Amino acid sequence: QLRQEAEQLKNQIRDARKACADATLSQITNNIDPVGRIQMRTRRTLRGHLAKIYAMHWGTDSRLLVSASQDGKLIIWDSYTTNKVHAIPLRSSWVMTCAYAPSGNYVACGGLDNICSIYNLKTREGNVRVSRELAGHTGYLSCCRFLDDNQIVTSSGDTTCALWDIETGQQTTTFTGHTGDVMSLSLAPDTRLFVSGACDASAKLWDVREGMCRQTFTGHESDINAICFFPNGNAFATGSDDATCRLFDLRADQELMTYSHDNIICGITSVSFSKSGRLLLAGYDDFNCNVWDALKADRAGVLAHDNRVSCLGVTDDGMAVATGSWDSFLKIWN
Amino acid sequence: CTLSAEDKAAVERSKMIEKQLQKDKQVYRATHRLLLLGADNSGKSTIVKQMRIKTSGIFETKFQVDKVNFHMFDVGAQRDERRKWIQCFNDVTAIIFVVDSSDYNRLQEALNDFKSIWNNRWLRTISVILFLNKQDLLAEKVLAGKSKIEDYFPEFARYTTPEDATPEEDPRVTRAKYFIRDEFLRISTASGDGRHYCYPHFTCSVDTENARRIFNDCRDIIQRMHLRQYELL
């Protein structure tokens, strides 16, 4: 009896959502001139990692950035002068993510260790030392992001997320409800909501303050690899192992126009927007990073690394864009 | 040059960092990395604790054989699905699989696990060093005769020991041993197109020669890879 009620309620939901689409984005868009072609050149090349590169994260001042590798190192670079400011050796050799604090006082990392570590950069001594170690998860860490100097949001492989308190080191909220393991999360500019995409081919919306899911989005038939969040705050884009990426809206609660090409077979690994939201930067599996028009489903340009492009990043001021790859090279583009 | 007084110290510090990184790079290329897989019943813990002589995710172990360094990573408290984190281990030298052959009950799931590992797309071009552990319990339980294999594997009745058998104990236990080996090798040799190989063994509960066996198998693996690269094999 309960199953039938759930089925009819789901049917009612999809029917109510169905009677809301009157026009497609493409026909409204047809009255907009295309952006044309985009040309970017490799300004700088940062070298020094041994193994593959899996993560990177820009700084807020738009100069410094941090990257992670499988040999067990974190390196903080000076983008303008290519110098190296720091080099941090890790306890565990298998890491999957890194984050760089908004104030620039801390960095974090995690991986096949079920532990998130916090590193203090500005000390009375001249060395960088670990501050906290946040244990309590079961599966491998796949993402982590800073709220402020005391709050951090983690994504794990045991199909749960969590909100932590760095001062004490105890969880204050656990977000449960994903069927498969979750891989990526993105925050909002107003730091009140965040999304997360998992391997059950669905993405969910969460409320940080009170801590329960508000909306659930579907449409992909394979697992979700990357998720980014629109600069306005009312949309987001996902990236799947289906060689396809979609755009969803938080009010219409529907799949808007999708970006797919007939010459792509491999899934994507990273997604990011530009400052104005006109461009969509996607890192692919066939050694390439394509550039999409976020309104017309056109390939404005191509960014061509000798192995998989694993990570991306766009500066706060929009001046540059960095890419990482499994050949252990970081390139800065504009 | 146009650099300031405080910009030369920055490049000096960067150069010292690069020197340290190059030293670490030289250290990193003389080490071989291994991945250890198995089930809870199989004695992974016993062999890993012998070779060296909380809900953590990985455990790391080091051992030295003939001035060669080996890294053997054991994946610990994870979930029941391995499809996602298995892509990180596509550059190791070899995979080690441990099987408990005394049970006969949960031994069919072991074959499925081995098939899943062998047929993985991210794990091709990587060889497997099969370990067949817990032989003394096998012998004790078969000589008693309380449990019969035919009750679990009815094909065991119509099987005869191979001519290649070299039992260096009994005229029957060897039939069961080589039956289990034949099952695993029948799974192994169904495909593989000559890019990775399987090396069965007869490890016991306590042994002092596992490291030497791993050394020899890794030597053979890398030598075959090099010969194939230069078109000599």
């Epitope: 400011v85 009375r124 001594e125 001249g126 | 300031s4 007084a5 110290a9 920055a10 000096e12 510090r13």
Partner: single-chain antibody
Framework: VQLVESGGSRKLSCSAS????????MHWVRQAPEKGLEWVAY????????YYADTVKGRFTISRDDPKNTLFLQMTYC??????????????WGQGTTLTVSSADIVMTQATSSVPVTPGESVSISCRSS???????????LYWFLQRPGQSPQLLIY???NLASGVPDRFSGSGSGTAFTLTISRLEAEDVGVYYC?????????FGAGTKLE
């Protein structure tokens, strides 16, 4: 952090204990009995670069011993300094042993020498250099130290605008390229002392003259 030294043809030693001595460059700075500060020598972190004061070059020699965390100066204040993007050099000074010894460089003079003030009122102190300290990259290398009557000098401002770590937020810095000023909004009894002016565009780190506050 606490580096305390005692010594004094003669040899001087400065011993450090409390921080990563191997990541910091070191300096030696001289103070005459009745005259402002003066620079002597400098040794890099990796011992790859060494400079000496133009006045004495053949009679002096510096060396460092990283394993035992000791600094040396040979007769024939020891100050930390670390350089990278966003660092604060000259932040910590030693307990103090002065070194009384019996052209094209940048010279700068402070306008006055003394001024009487009253608590609760703002004060201004001026410095002026021969040539512009603003560089092509954008940094303006100016430092304020504010030695107190009895102790070693401290650090207040670096790069003419950035406030130090532990100093109260009553100090500020501003300038235009050649003329600079330091303003103290409020005032307390702990601000009594003499203030110094420094440049870091070139190796001869020419200090200023001093401005006593009574």
């Amino acid at each position: 952090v606490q580096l305390v030294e005692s010594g004094g043809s003669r040899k001087l030693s400065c011993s450090a204990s409390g921080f990563a001595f191997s990541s910091f460059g070191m300096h030696w700075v001289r103070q005459a009995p009745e005259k402002g500060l003066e620079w002597v020598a400098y040794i890099s972190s990796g011992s790859g670069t060494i400079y000496y004061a133009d006045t004495v070059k053949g009679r002096f020699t510096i060396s460092r011993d990283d394993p035992k965390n000791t600094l040396f100066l040979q007769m024939t204040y020891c100050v930390r300094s670390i350089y990278y993007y966003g660092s604060s050099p000259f932040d910590f000074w030693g307990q103090g042993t002065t070194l009384t010894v019996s052209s094209a460089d940048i010279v700068m003079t402070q306008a006055t020498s003394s001024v009487p003030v009253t608590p609760g009122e703002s004060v201004s102190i001026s410095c002026r250099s021969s040539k512009s300290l603003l560089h092509s990259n954008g940094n303006t290398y100016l430092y304020w130290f504010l030695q107190r009557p009895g102790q070693s000098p401290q650090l207040l401002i670096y790069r003419m605008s950035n406030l130090a770590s532990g100093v109260p937020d009553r100090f500020s810095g501003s300038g235009s390229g050649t003329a600079f000023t330091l303003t103290i909004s409020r005032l307390e009894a702990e601000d009594v002392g003499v203030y110094y002016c420094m440049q870091h565009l070139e190796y001869p780190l020419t200090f200023g003259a001093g401005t006593k506050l009574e």
